[PDB]
Structures are given as structure tokens and as C-alpha cells.
Amino acid sequence: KTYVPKQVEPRWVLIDAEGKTLGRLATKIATLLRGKHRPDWTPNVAMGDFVVVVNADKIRVTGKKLEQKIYTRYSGYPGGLKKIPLEKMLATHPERVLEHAVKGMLPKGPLGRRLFKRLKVYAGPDHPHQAQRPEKL
Amino acid sequence: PKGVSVEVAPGRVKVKGPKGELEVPVSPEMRVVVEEGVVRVERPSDERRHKSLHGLTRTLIANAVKGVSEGYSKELLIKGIGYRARLVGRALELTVGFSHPVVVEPPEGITFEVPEPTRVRVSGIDKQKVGQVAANIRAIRKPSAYHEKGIYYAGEPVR
Amino acid sequence: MKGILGVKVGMTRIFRDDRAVPVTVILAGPCPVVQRRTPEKDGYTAVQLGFLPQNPKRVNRPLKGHFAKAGVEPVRILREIRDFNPEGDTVTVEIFKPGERVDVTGTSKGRGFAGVMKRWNFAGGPDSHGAHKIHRHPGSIGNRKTPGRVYKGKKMAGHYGAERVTVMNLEVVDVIPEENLLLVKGAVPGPNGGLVIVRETKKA
RNA sequence: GUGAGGGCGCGAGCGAUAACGUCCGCGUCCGAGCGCGGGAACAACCGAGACCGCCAGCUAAGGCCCCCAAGUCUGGGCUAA
RNA sequence: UGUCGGCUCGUCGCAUCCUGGGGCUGAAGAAGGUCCCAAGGGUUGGGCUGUUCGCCCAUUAAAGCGGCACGCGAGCUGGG
RNA sequence: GCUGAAAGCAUCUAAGCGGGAAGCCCGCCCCAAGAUGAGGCCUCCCACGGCGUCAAGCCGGUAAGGACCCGGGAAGACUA
Lengths: 137, 159, 204
Ligand SMILES: [Mg+2]
Ligand SMILES: [Mg+2]
Ligand SMILES: [Mg+2]
Ligand SMILES: [Mg+2]
Ligand SMILES: [Mg+2]
Ligand SMILES: [Mg+2]
Ligand SMILES: [Mg+2]
Ligand SMILES: [Mg+2]
Ligand SMILES: [Mg+2]
Ligand SMILES: [Mg+2]
Ligand SMILES: [Mg+2]
Ligand SMILES: [Mg+2]
Ligand SMILES: [Mg+2]
Ligand SMILES: [Mg+2]
Ligand SMILES: [Mg+2]
Ligand SMILES: [Mg+2]
Ligand SMILES: [Mg+2]
Ligand SMILES: [Mg+2]
Ligand SMILES: [Mg+2]
Ligand SMILES: [Mg+2]
Ligand SMILES: [Mg+2]
Ligand SMILES: [Mg+2]
Ligand SMILES: [Mg+2]
Ligand SMILES: [Mg+2]
Ligand SMILES: [Mg+2]
Ligand SMILES: [Mg+2]
Ligand SMILES: [Mg+2]
Ligand SMILES: [Mg+2]
Ligand SMILES: [Mg+2]
Ligand SMILES: [Mg+2]
Ligand SMILES: [Mg+2]
Ligand SMILES: [Mg+2]
Ligand SMILES: [Mg+2]
Ligand SMILES: [Mg+2]
Ligand SMILES: [Mg+2]
Ligand SMILES: [Mg+2]
Ligand SMILES: [Mg+2]
Ligand SMILES: [Mg+2]
Ligand SMILES: [Mg+2]
Ligand SMILES: [Mg+2]
Ligand SMILES: [Mg+2]
Ligand SMILES: [Mg+2]
Ligand SMILES: [Mg+2]
Ligand SMILES: [Mg+2]
Ligand SMILES: [Mg+2]
Ligand SMILES: [Mg+2]
Ligand SMILES: [Mg+2]
Ligand SMILES: [Mg+2]
Ligand SMILES: [Mg+2]
Ligand SMILES: [Mg+2]
Ligand SMILES: [Mg+2]
Ligand SMILES: [Mg+2]
Ligand SMILES: [Mg+2]
Ligand SMILES: [Mg+2]
Ligand SMILES: [Mg+2]
Ligand SMILES: [Mg+2]
Ligand SMILES: [Mg+2]
Ligand SMILES: [Mg+2]
Ligand SMILES: [Mg+2]
Ligand SMILES: [Mg+2]
Ligand SMILES: [Mg+2]
Ligand SMILES: [Mg+2]
Ligand SMILES: [Mg+2]
Ligand SMILES: [Mg+2]
Ligand SMILES: [Mg+2]
Ligand SMILES: [Mg+2]
Ligand SMILES: [Mg+2]
Ligand SMILES: [Mg+2]
Ligand SMILES: [Mg+2]
Hints:
Largest sheet of chain C: 6 strands, antiparallel, barrel
Largest sheet of chain A: 2 strands, antiparallel
Strand order of the largest sheet of chain A: 1-2
InterPro entries (chain C): Ribosomal_uL3, Ribosomal_uL3_bac/org-type, Ribosomal_uL3_CS, Transl_B-barrel_sf
Strand order of the largest sheet of chain C: 1-2-11-10-7-12
Shape of chain A: globular
Structural class of chain A: mainly alpha
Oligomer: part of a larger assembly
Strand content of chain C: 35-45%
Family (chain C): Belongs to the universal ribosomal protein uL3 family.
Organism (chain C): Thermus thermophilus (strain ATCC BAA-163 / DSM 7039 / HB27)
Number of helices of chain A: 5
Number of helices of chain C: 2
Distance between the termini of chain A: 36 Å
Pfam families (chain C): Ribosomal_L3
Helix content of chain C: under 10%
Strand content of chain A: under 5%
Number of strands of chain A: 2
Order of helices and strands of chain A: HHEEHHH
Shape of chain C: extended
Radius of gyration of chain C: 23 Å
Order of helices and strands of chain C: EEEEHEEEEHEEEE
GO molecular function (chain C): rRNA binding; structural constituent of ribosome
Bound molecules: magnesium ion
């Protein structure tokens, strides 16, 4: 009768950012947000790592994406569809790019939201130096 | 390549000379081979995409060297009755036909001069900087397609 | 960026040279700076102006401690002028000289639950040739199965007025330091005896 | 009982070498398999015919970067949109 | 699943009527022709007819076209 | 339009740069921390008093403060 895991403890990570490809980074990242790397994994629980990214401003991306890759954002209003090119995002709040890229790869349920909080994104590097900062790659 | 001072970095290249010095960002996947009294460039292949990048860095640097070798500059002919330039301080002010007489800023690295109201040269260390500022002035009043007025280069009239 | 609190007293008219000029009398009464707002520890620049004196009977609130931490006479009302760091004391109508121009904020008169007729200056329907139960009504508000809903923003009858209103580029005609009076070109929100802030414009 | 059939492939007429059009022929699936996997979703397209149970196992189509099981697999090309 | 027109309220497209920008011109200038970019906002009042449409009067920067069950009758009208 | 190769020349382009619209982003006026990703600054109040050992709770008294009620208001359907 399959093993159900008990109360674990958060394992904070610290991913870099500079150089890494937007998409390819996100992929790995989420698979940490979900515990899916840890054998003691279970769907209903939610116990993936506390991922922490730094220098997201230095995310690279292939091709003309800097210009072409537009984000949409529909305010409820008429004509309210407001679009925004990748450039403009990185210009302004940059972590924003990496944030959604990941969000869009997390499951769509409530804990999927719970999982999103687990991710701390930045551009510095330097976070609030809590405790665990186990660098990764 | 005499009295020149070439150098190398990840992507760019320096070129020092009597005139000064300039950054010359160049192809990354290209060789900036420096020799004794000469330089050079070598491409990693023979692709259609490679060829184009070679020659560019080839010329690009050579003009960089030439820039501090002597420095570039260009003419400017002011045709038309009223039209006439006047070097005020460092900057060029020139009348032409607008009720307000246009005044032109003196950009850094460039120095223009009015040897005569019907002449304006533009001396500079950068072939690029030279090029724009040249046209900038011509732009102030293109040649009259129906006469012979306003700025001109050393190229034929429009007629 | 000048700024100063006041109260709308009422309005009449004066004659410039030989041509009459309608004017509202703001009263930019003495305002003691009660706290400065710097990026160092606030994140932004501005100045907490105080306005109108107060009997310590209501100020029972530890506000007394706020006024104390700046040695000021406990006022009744205080709001911030943004990006405006004066000198360490008190602003007057004096910040404004005649000929200057000012933007002015106030709380418009409260028109309560408004008819779309007035709230949005609609046009309703015929006083005559029929229907008679739709005179001051809005008429259609959408279309058939598609879209099948109503736009977030649709002008419909509701609370109108008593909102915040800024009116732009009024000229400061006169300024009587004697009794703290600002003289502007009339059109200023709020009713008499109402509170109102006044500041430099954006002609440039 | 049935004598409304329907879609798809193919072969013709009609049609305009239109139609989720129509009318026959051969086949097929839905009808009655709106049960199961694939195709995002979807009677009839691909896979397959559910007697019930199992916290076993191989595979079908399809698929193996994350949502989402399983290769960011290996080798040789091409494409810069 | 109430059908034309009007009225009220609109909103979206752009194959752009006007204002903005631009190439060409059989563009001297002024004015215009034509194509390209460009919805932000604007796009009048009356006569005739149920009218839509259209003709006409007087103006305009212009008096655009079209989608929204030829938008809109649990909103209105009810001339057809 | 500059500089410029493939492609000895030439080319505004392929590397790169400048110019360029009522348009895009900001700037202007309004809303806005239910921005659950609930922000921030100034000031004020401050222990247990009683069951719960262990644990988060529970109880009557409290503080700064607030509320009810009443007199009203260019606030207002009511409430706020
Ligand atoms: Mg590093
Ligand atoms: Mg760019
Ligand atoms: Mg749209
Ligand atoms: Mg807008
Ligand atoms: Mg930090
Ligand atoms: Mg020399
Ligand atoms: Mg020279
Ligand atoms: Mg010279
Ligand atoms: Mg010289
Ligand atoms: Mg206080
Ligand atoms: Mg403000
Ligand atoms: Mg500001
Ligand atoms: Mg003062
Ligand atoms: Mg009637
Ligand atoms: Mg009747
Ligand atoms: Mg009636
Ligand atoms: Mg009736
Ligand atoms: Mg009735
Ligand atoms: Mg209806
Ligand atoms: Mg709908
Ligand atoms: Mg004085
Ligand atoms: Mg006095
Ligand atoms: Mg039959
Ligand atoms: Mg049949
Ligand atoms: Mg059959
Ligand atoms: Mg059949
Ligand atoms: Mg057919
Ligand atoms: Mg069968
Ligand atoms: Mg199904
Ligand atoms: Mg389908
Ligand atoms: Mg079926
Ligand atoms: Mg099926
Ligand atoms: Mg197997
Ligand atoms: Mg297989
Ligand atoms: Mg297979
Ligand atoms: Mg391969
Ligand atoms: Mg391969
Ligand atoms: Mg177009
Ligand atoms: Mg046309
Ligand atoms: Mg135009
Ligand atoms: Mg002309
Ligand atoms: Mg033209
Ligand atoms: Mg008739
Ligand atoms: Mg008309
Ligand atoms: Mg319309
Ligand atoms: Mg129709
Ligand atoms: Mg139709
Ligand atoms: Mg209709
Ligand atoms: Mg009716
Ligand atoms: Mg009707
Ligand atoms: Mg109707
Ligand atoms: Mg009747
Ligand atoms: Mg009749
Ligand atoms: Mg009738
Ligand atoms: Mg030229
Ligand atoms: Mg060249
Ligand atoms: Mg060739
Ligand atoms: Mg050449
Ligand atoms: Mg380029
Ligand atoms: Mg610039
Ligand atoms: Mg530019
Ligand atoms: Mg506000
Ligand atoms: Mg607030
Ligand atoms: Mg956010
Ligand atoms: Mg005590
Ligand atoms: Mg104790
Ligand atoms: Mg106890
Ligand atoms: Mg009361
Ligand atoms: Mg009351």
C-alpha cells in the first residue's frame, strides 16, 4: 500500500540566471517547485523546493524575441487589450519575464498558486540572505 | 598602419593614434590577428553568412586605423541667393530661407568649419560620425529639384 | 513645486484696469510643515502641511505626539504636497505672486444618486410622440446574443459628484498677505467653506 | 421490429471539378459502441470491441521540454521565417 | 429566436472621409492626381418620402464605409 | 539617410547607427494594497489577571482607541 510522505522541510535553492535561456531555465525551475525531483514526491501535498533566482535581468533568449515576443494583458474594459514586447518588460520590471514563463508551466489548480509563492525572483543578484542559499546550476 | 596602436578584447578592438582613439566593436566569431606593423582578420569558415561578416570587420577596422591616421572630413556647397553659412563659436549657424535662421550643435568628436559662407567642411576621427553630420546639414535644406539652391555635396546638381 | 492648503470662501469680481474679472476667494491660511518626506526613509519627496488650528479636546488622540515631535500647534487637517521641500517652517499665500498660475484640487458638490440624463448629459427620449415612460431613460445598453453582456465602463445612472476634482491652470490674480487670501479666476471645485489645496501648474 | 438514416474512402450523375448540398453503386463506422486511449475540446478520422475484481504486467494509435506518463536520447543534413 | 425605418445609447474593423506622416507626379508656386503609413479624435443643420437608398438647399476640416441577430421593441416609437 | 560586406564596384542591412506620425510608452486629471504578491512612513498603547502543563486555544477585567445614543451637514435612497 504505497508510501505517503510525512511533514518534510523546505529545501531552499539558489539558481543563477545570467546566460541561461528563458524557457529552458523555467522548465527545470518548476520541476523543483513541484517536488517532482524528490522521490518522496506526492501530488496532493505540495513540497517542492524554495527556488530563488538572481540576476534574471541577464536572461538570454534566442532570435528576435526581444522585439517580437509580445505579452498580452486584457483589462476588463472595452479596447482594454494592452500588449507589451519583451524588450519593454526587461527594460522595466524584468523578473516579470522569468516569473510568468514559470507560472505558465505550473499546474492550474490552487496549490499551483501555492507553488508560485515558493518562487522568489530578482535581479541583482543578492536576495534577502535568509539562511539556505545552496547554489545550483 | 604606422604610428597606430591596435589592440584586442572579447568582441571589440582599440585603435590609438595621433588623433586620439576609438572603440571598434566587431564580429565575435572573427579573428583580430595582430601582426608587427600590420593587423588582420580571419573567418572560421566559408559560408555565405561568414563571408559577409569577414569583409565588414576587414574594412571596419581599417577605417578605424585610418581615422586616427589623418581623420576624415567632407565638403558642403551652399547654393542659392540668401543661403549662406556662418561659423559662430564652435557651432554652425546657417541661414537658407526659413524666417528663423537654423543653428547646428557641434557634436563631440566632430569639428566643422566655414572657410567661406559658400563652403562647410566637417572634420572628424570617425567615418561614421562624419557621415551623419554631413547629411544632417544637407538635410537642413535638400537641393531644389527645380532649381539650384540649398546644400550640396560634390555630387551633380538635380536640375 | 509650490503648494499650500486653503478653504474656498466664496467668489465675486474685481476690475483689472478697465475690464471686469470674476474671481474665487481661496484662503490659504498659515500652514505649518508637520513632517518632511525624503527618499532616505519614505521613498519619495513631499511635505506634510498642516492647516487650521484645533482645541486639544479632540486631539486627545496621540496625534498630540505627532504634533509634539515637531513642536507645532495641533491643527485640524493635514495633507501632503508632493515633490515640494520648502524651508523648515511655514508656507503662506506668499509662495504665490500675482500673474502666476495654479492648479487647484477640491471635492465637488455632492449630487447624490444621479439620473443618467445629468450624470452623463445624455439625451433620453421624446417629451411627446409616445412611450411616455422613457423620457429621461438611457435607451438600449447593448446588442443581441453577441457580445451578450455589457462593457465595464458603461455610462449608467449612479452617484455623481462629491468626487475629487482638480481644475487646471487658473491664474492667480491677487494675493492679500494681510489676511491670507488667494485670488484666482473663479472656477474652483467644492462649495463655500470647503477644503481645497492649491499648487503650481503644468504649463511646463 | 424496420420501411426519416448519417458521416468517411472510393466510383459516377446533378451542382459551379460550391455546400455539414444532393442522387445511385461498393465498402465502412455512428445509429445501437455520446463505453475506453489518441486527435486540446468534438457520433462516425487513427487505435480498440467494456462479464466483474486487482495500489500487477506487454503493447496499439499517439507520444517522451514544463502544464502532462516517458529521452532536454544518439548520428547526418536543412531552415532564420 | 417579433420582423423595416426612426429614437436613445453605443462599441468594434479598416479596404481612411477629415486632421497627422511619407514616395512618386504629366509637382514652378498655390492647388491637385495617385500609391504607402496611420484609428487618436472628429465626421453639421434642413426640404422631399414610412422609408433604407437617393435627389436637393445651406454650410464643413470632413460631411468615410462596414461588423455587432442588416447591434439595440423584458428600452422607446409603431409611419411602413 | 550614415557607416558596410557578401559581391575589388555598387547597396539604408545582413553586424551596427541616426532621422521620422493626430499614432505607441510615459508625461496630464480620476480610481486604486481584496496589488491574499494585502505595501510604506509618523505617533500612541503594552505583558496574565483566570482555567489550558506540554500545543494552538478558552474566560471575565483592561490600554491607546472605537462604538452606541443624541444635535446636525452644499454627505446621503438606506447605510456610508
Ligand atoms: Mg555568475
Ligand atoms: Mg533594440
Ligand atoms: Mg480590438
Ligand atoms: Mg488608451
Ligand atoms: Mg535584494
Ligand atoms: Mg598626416
Ligand atoms: Mg582632412
Ligand atoms: Mg578640412
Ligand atoms: Mg582636418
Ligand atoms: Mg499620533
Ligand atoms: Mg498627485
Ligand atoms: Mg510627479
Ligand atoms: Mg513660505
Ligand atoms: Mg403611446
Ligand atoms: Mg397608441
Ligand atoms: Mg408607455
Ligand atoms: Mg403605448
Ligand atoms: Mg406601458
Ligand atoms: Mg432585447
Ligand atoms: Mg457572451
Ligand atoms: Mg511680506
Ligand atoms: Mg493676519
Ligand atoms: Mg426511404
Ligand atoms: Mg442513404
Ligand atoms: Mg446504410
Ligand atoms: Mg453510407
Ligand atoms: Mg460534399
Ligand atoms: Mg456496429
Ligand atoms: Mg467523448
Ligand atoms: Mg476538431
Ligand atoms: Mg456515437
Ligand atoms: Mg467518438
Ligand atoms: Mg514496459
Ligand atoms: Mg514501441
Ligand atoms: Mg510507438
Ligand atoms: Mg539529432
Ligand atoms: Mg541533427
Ligand atoms: Mg492600411
Ligand atoms: Mg484607396
Ligand atoms: Mg492624410
Ligand atoms: Mg505643392
Ligand atoms: Mg502626396
Ligand atoms: Mg406610402
Ligand atoms: Mg447630412
Ligand atoms: Mg455603425
Ligand atoms: Mg442578413
Ligand atoms: Mg449578415
Ligand atoms: Mg435590426
Ligand atoms: Mg414593443
Ligand atoms: Mg421595432
Ligand atoms: Mg427598430
Ligand atoms: Mg396607433
Ligand atoms: Mg401612411
Ligand atoms: Mg399601420
Ligand atoms: Mg545621401
Ligand atoms: Mg564602404
Ligand atoms: Mg553574384
Ligand atoms: Mg564599397
Ligand atoms: Mg542591421
Ligand atoms: Mg536618439
Ligand atoms: Mg529615432
Ligand atoms: Mg489617490
Ligand atoms: Mg490608499
Ligand atoms: Mg504582480
Ligand atoms: Mg500596565
Ligand atoms: Mg505567568
Ligand atoms: Mg495556568
Ligand atoms: Mg445622527
Ligand atoms: Mg443623520
